[PDB]
A paper describes a structure:
Clathrin mediates vesicular transport between post‐Golgi membranes in eukaryotes and is targeted to specific membranes by interactions with clathrin adaptor proteins. A total of 3 consensus clathrin‐binding peptide sequences have been identified and structural studies show that each binds distinct sites on the clathrin heavy chain N‐terminal domain (NTD). We have solved high‐resolution structures of NTD bound to peptide motifs from the cellular clathrin adaptors β2 adaptin and amphiphysin plus a putative viral clathrin adaptor, hepatitis D virus large antigen (HDAg‐L). Surprisingly, with each peptide we observe simultaneous peptide binding at multiple sites on NTD and viral peptides binding to the same sites as cellular peptides.
To investigate whether the absence of AmphCBMpep binding at the Royle box arose from an absence of stabilizing residues C‐terminal to the CBM motif, we solved the structure of NTD in complex with a longer sequence containing the human amphiphysin I CBM (AmphCBMlongpep, sequence ETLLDLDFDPFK). As observed for AmphCBMpep, AmphCBMlongpep bound NTD at the CBM and arrestin boxes but not at the Royle box. However, unlike at the arrestin box, residues that form the molecular interactions at the Royle box do not correspond to those conserved in the LΦxΦ[DE] consensus CBM sequence and we note that several peptides containing a CBM sequence (AP2CBMpep, AmphCBMpep and AmphCBMlongpep) do not bind at the Royle box. Together, this suggests that a distinct consensus sequence mediates binding of cellular proteins at the Royle box.
Residue numbers in the entry:
A (entry chain E): 1 to 9
B (entry chain G): 1 to 12
C (entry chain A): 4 to 363
The structure:
Amino acid sequence: ETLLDLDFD
Amino acid sequence: ETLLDLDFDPFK
Amino acid sequence: ILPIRFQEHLQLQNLGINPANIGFSTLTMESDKFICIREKVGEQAQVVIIDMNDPSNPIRRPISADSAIMNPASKVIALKAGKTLQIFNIEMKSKMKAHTMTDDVTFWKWISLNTVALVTDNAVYHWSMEGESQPVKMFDRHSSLAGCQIINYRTDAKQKWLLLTGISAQQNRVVGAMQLYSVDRKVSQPIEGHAASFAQFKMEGNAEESTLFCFAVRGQAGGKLHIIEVGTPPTGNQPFPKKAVDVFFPPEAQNDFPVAMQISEKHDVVFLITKYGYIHLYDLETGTCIYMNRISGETIFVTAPHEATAGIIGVNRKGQVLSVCVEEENIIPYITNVLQNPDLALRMAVRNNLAGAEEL
């Protein structure tokens, strides 16, 4: 579970 | 035990 | 001349923010550095992060969280989804921390640069970001806050005096219930109150600062503001003499009440904002009311200290981001000539190093 997507640019 | 007296205290 | 200065910083609707997301559950402002807004655009939930030093370039990132609160000083963000808490360093693209609670978190906030406070239905916890710390319970919730909407949690600088605030409807008014907890005494006191802050204040003649608790309440009998020292004075200190003063509500504002307080330790003034848009300024030392006016049409639902001006910054339901601070050139002649209080004028001029008391 990961609440924030930081792979998104 | 109370932490604070919120009323006027003549003796302080 | 006014003793305060109003400034509009932003209109969030000019950045594409839907007004349905401009509210207490979806918009957070943990300091004057960032605003975070949870929005759902299409199928995807997102967080919009407004850097207040670059506000025309907000960043949108996908999330799956029910709440997001940015650290007061750094691009480190805390997110939660039910019992799952996660902390990210955004620039490092890093998951710093993850913790799974055993209760849902109803309210949370950064209470310092490195500690998050977590409120559940039953208790309050602090969670330090230093080392491998986990949440530590501070106190159990007092039954007087049962069923309240939790709206704030504050502490003194040393995190020894803790204050939880909830509200609810009773006898057709919004009633505030506070729980003040002493970490050293392990004692709670229930207090009727709507908005509060702690402050450090060094009295003339004292070697050490006093820790003051200031709260405002609209009670059944009317509005009151209290300023009172918490704890035993440091050895050598005179105790701070407690103050209690009226908080005015005009006849047409029968249902108004206090919603936010920030204290400037630069000027030793208390800013108080009400639900329906009024601003009051009080002297911290005496509680003297310096100024009142209506400054929002719209309800202001979140505030923070405004570091640059030592004022208060806030967001209203329209999405206006607005600050109020002491107008340093006008406050002393205002107090002398409009309030006709040369004693206060002279005191504040000397206490806070302000011009204007050269003629009284």
